[PDB]
């Protein structure tokens with residue numbers, strides 16, 4: 001029917017207009033800074049409920065980590081501790097490589113070897129990143145807990161809950177985190193160096209491509225090479241093929257209608273990365289960071305994003 | 319071919335969304351709070367999730383709660399002239415036949431309104447003090463010292479003072495038809511009771527809307543009502559359906575919506591969240607006050623706009 005076709009083009013048109021309408025109301029042109037930690041209520045009303053990012057300054061002054069932490073300090077304090085290390089040939093763990101979703105090779109290594117690689121004292125095949133997540137800071141590096149807080153009190157009070165995980169990040173500058181989103185409210189604390197975040201708001205979903213990929217894992221051979229081993233037990237994983245830094249607009253032309261939001265988080269600063277926001281992460285050499293993950297609330301904003309996601313696919317936009 | 323399959327997929331998702339959203343975000347019964355919440359709790363537990371609740375013991379400081387009554391009004395502000403909505407049948411701002419009917423507005427001394435409520439005097443049609451536009455401070459200023467000009471914990475939570483404070487005093491036949499407001503509403507019943515039927519905003523795909531030419535009631539000298547079309551008025555979208563007696567032959571999809579009902583009693587305060595569809599019935603001479611805070615125009619608002627546009631665009635409305 002011709003009337004049916006007109007209704008579908010009106011739907012597709014509304015979906016395509018939504019990211020611009022939403023960003024005009026809800027999304028800042030630049031990530032704003034706070035000069036000091038907000039009150040819990042201010043945090044909930046100004047940032048959490050509206051689901052929008054900010055960087056908080058002067059929130060890590062109680063952390064001994066801010067003065068002490070460095071690669072030599074780590075060597076002295078936890079250098080012999082065994083940690084899960086992610087390894088990839090090119091620095092892209094959990095990323096689309098060709099026709100597969102590639103997961104990294106996980107290797108258990110003393111932290112001193114990571115420090116050696118980062119300081120150029122040693123050579124290793126590929127790119128190293130201590131990225132395990134899964135609350136790896138209390139689990140693998142408990143000796144470091146005295147150097148920081150077990151949670152961000154004003155944020156825990158605001159969200160009415162405690163952190164579900166506290167993660168330690170340490171990697172080469174070549175280790176890049178490709179575009180993805182999380183089901184968590186994220187307080188990302190850069191202790192040393194700098195992180196470069198590229199964001200897309202949830203409302204850009206109509207212009208963010210997703211594809212289904214066979215999952216596979218890198219395997220490091222004794223000869224210093226990387227094998228691709230398929231994960232037969234996993235179902236195909238949906239992932240964003242697109243590289244926000246050099247997007248393949250010939251394949252995904254509609255991505256040009258998305259709009260990226262960029263910011264840099266420096267030592268001493270805390271990024272609030274709101275739940276469901278797409279993000280892509282780069283780092284300076286041996287950047288040290290800690291992030292607190294608080295579980296998001298499964299509320300109206302979550303239901304709406306599920307609708308937006310489903311409609312993006314049902315309508316043919318993705 | 320492909321277009322018809324993509325459209326029914328889209329339509330199916332829109333039809334499935336009200337159940338998914340309510341099963342996750344909408345209570346089966348309006349919850350009660352034993353006492354006023356803290357601002358943070360109010361915002362986190364009710365405002366941000368866009369969830370209604372009834373607060374008990376929130377007006378016990380109000381002198382109005384011990385003093386207000388029709389006889390107290392008679393003695394205190396009886397001679398005061400107030401704006402009164404008059405309709406033949408008690409449905410102001412409602413779809414009647416093929417028109418959106420606006421009430422006849424009359425300036426009457428409160429005494430007379432009180433006589434009508436008490437059966438002392440008769441009057442054609444149905445009266446309702448329902449001007450809104452912050453009519454309490456505007457028309458009954460003498461009553462202000464009997465209550466707070468705002469709800470402090472709610473103003474702190476929302477970071478702003480109320481945009482309006484309204485006084486409500488009507489007959490039992492004066493019914494408010496289904497509609498939604500872009501305000502956070504703290505609705506306070508001082509005397510009598512109010513019966514609220516709700517639909518959450520996510521029921522929009524199943525709530526019918528139509529465009530109506532607007533008209534107004536004129537009370538004749540003969541004691542009857544005429545309809546005067548508002549020729550210089552753009553048409554007004556409104557919900558043709560009575561949620562309590564829905565016309566399921568005309569709007570069958572409305573059976574897929576799910577209403578949520580509650581009663582608010584003297585001394586109780588209802589938080590009616592922004593964009594929630596509500597229909598209101600009252601007891602004869604019910605006395606109520608409500609505080610309107612403009613809503614925040616954030617992601618939740620943008621999502622509802624998209625849901626609203628897609629409902630029309632897909633042909634579900």
Ligand SMILES: O=C(O)CCC(=O)C(=O)O
Pocket residue numbers: 169176177182186188279281282291
């Ligand atoms: O720091 C990174 O490389 C990625 C961080 C991230 O994605 C997260 O904290 O959710």
Ligand SMILES: O=C(O)CCC(=O)C(=O)O
Pocket residue numbers: 486493494499503505596598599608
């Ligand atoms: O009390 C009534 O009759 C209607 C109340 C209402 O619609 C409101 O307070 O927004």
Ligand SMILES: [Mn+2]
Pocket residue numbers: 180181182279
């Ligand atoms: Mn992440």
Ligand SMILES: [Mn+2]
Pocket residue numbers: 497498499596
């Ligand atoms: Mn209303």
